[PDB]
Design a protein around this ligand. Structure first.
Ligand SMILES: Cc1cc2nc3c(=O)[nH]c(=O)nc-3n(C[C@H](O)[C@H](O)[C@H](O)COP(=O)(O)O)c2cc1C
Ligand SMILES: CN(c1ccccc1)c1ccc2c(c1)CCC[C@H]2CNc1cnccc1C(=O)O
Ligand SMILES: O=C(O)c1cc(=O)[nH]c(=O)[nH]1
Length: 356
């Protein structure tokens, strides 16, 4: 498209050249929230529809947590063409997060490093924001555009389980799915924590009862992954989000800011994330839905995660470089690749590498 090339080659580089990454983030949220966006003319085909987590998703490409931390831009993100929106992380009480600067761009690597530290308006502010559009969301969800809420914990919390429990009670009734991050940059403690989360979820009225997913880092040992898969199956967790940012620094990063503290996102995370999907799919015998995330910026990227075991994918970093046209780009390329490889639709491709 003309927009894709123009955004990617001219507009987005100029905007990034003018604005530090955090300022750029804020501007993007503000523009999205006001619907000041190019016209998303890609109409989603039936091939892209997925049914998972008790919901219909008109397409499998979502916005990852962190872009819209406080639930300010949900409708604009649907307008951009995302098949689903995840907001958060939201903490129980408002908190400022880490001192600035805390977001860094690695243009040479198509990567970002962030150490925001869960800057959050808090549950109560986000609750009121979602309540203001609750019925609009119900219609969107019914039309195949679900909403996820990522729950965090406060810096000073003396018991993580209570922070997450509070999030379930307050935002669970407003979400199609909730996410508990065991990922932000004993199995018995994870079992305790997730048991408490599921109990709180099960205590919500049936029309207000969300799916619960666990979001993991790519930095886990083999033992950690085995332990997570075991607990997820034992307790009946509804899904996994794979992955958060990495605290590793893969060999070959060129950006001047590569040694900044924080989570690395984007292209250097891509295959690490895909491999983690592949492993978690196998450890859960393909019975636990996975949302695949990390360094997706093309149809090929999306399909590699789907074939590795993802039912859905998310992106964030690619949006910062390519702008809004990236969403339609990924969807269109994914559709073409599905046809080329002989799949009837996304559904047929989920986990296809494991049947090879
Ligand atoms: C600036 C920034 C902030 C993020 N904040 C959050 C967050 O609050 N909660 C969360 O679960 N993930 C957070 N993430 C991680 C993303 O949701 C995603 O897992 C990761 O960036 C990999 O996807 P990407 O390579 O497409 O960006 C953040 C990522 C970035 C770049
Ligand atoms: C929504 N949108 C839009 C683009 C054109 C026209 C109308 C809308 C849009 C989407 C994305 C963006 C911008 C604008 C403007 C700043 C650039 C990026 C955001 N950048 C970051 C975000 N989080 C973290 C880091 C960065 C970064 O730059 O390092
Ligand atoms: O808020 C943050 O700093 C944060 C949380 C998280 O899960 N991932 C990330 O990259 N940043």
């Amino acid at each position: 498209t003309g927009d894709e090339r123009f955004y990617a080659e001219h507009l987005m580089p100029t905007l990034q050249g003018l604005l530090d990454p955090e300022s750029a983030h804020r501007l993007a949220v503000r523009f999205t929230s006001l619907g000041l966006l190019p016209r998303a003319r890609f109409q989603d085909s039936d091939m892209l529809e997925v049914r998972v987590l008790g919901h219909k998703f008109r397409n499998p490409v979502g916005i990852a947590a962190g872009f819209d931390k406080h639930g300010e831009a949900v409708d604009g993100l649907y307008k951009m063409g995302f098949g689903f929106v995840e907001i958060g992380s939201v903490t129980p009480k408002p908190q400022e997060g880490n001192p600035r600067p805390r977001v860094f761009r690695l243009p040479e690597d198509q990567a970002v490093i962030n150490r925001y530290g869960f800057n959050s308006h808090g549950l109560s502010v986000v609750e009121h924001r979602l309540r203001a559009r609750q019925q609009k969301q119900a219609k969107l969800t019914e039309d195949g555009l679900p909403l996820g809420v990522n729950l965090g914990k406060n810096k000073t919390s003396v018991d993580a389980a209570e922070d997450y429990a509070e999030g379930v009670r307050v935002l669970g009734p407003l979400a199609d799915y909730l996410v508990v991050n065991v990922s932000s940059p004993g199995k018995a403690e994870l079992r305790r924590l997730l048991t408490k989360v599921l109990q709180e979820r099960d205590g919500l009225r049936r029309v207000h009862r969300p799916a619960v997913l666990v979001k993991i880092a790519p930095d886990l040992t083999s033992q950690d992954k085995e332990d997570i898969a075991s607990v997820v199956k034992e307790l009946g967790i509804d899904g996994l989000i794979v992955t958060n940012t990495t605290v590793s620094r893969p060999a070959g990063l060129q950006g001047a800011l590569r040694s900044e503290t924080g989570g690395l996102s984007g292209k250097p995370l891509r295959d690490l994330s895909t491999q983690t999907i592949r492993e978690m799919y196998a450890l859960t015998q393909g019975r636990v839905p996975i949302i695949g995330v990390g360094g997706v910026s093309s149809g090929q990227d999306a399909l590699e995660k789907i074939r590795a075991g993802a039912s859905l994918v998310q992106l964030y970093t690619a949006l910062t470089f390519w702008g809004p046209p990236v969403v339609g780009k990924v969807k269109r390329e994914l559709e073409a690749l599905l046809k080329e490889q002989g799949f009837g639709g996304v559904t047929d491709a989920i986990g296809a590498d494991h049947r090879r």
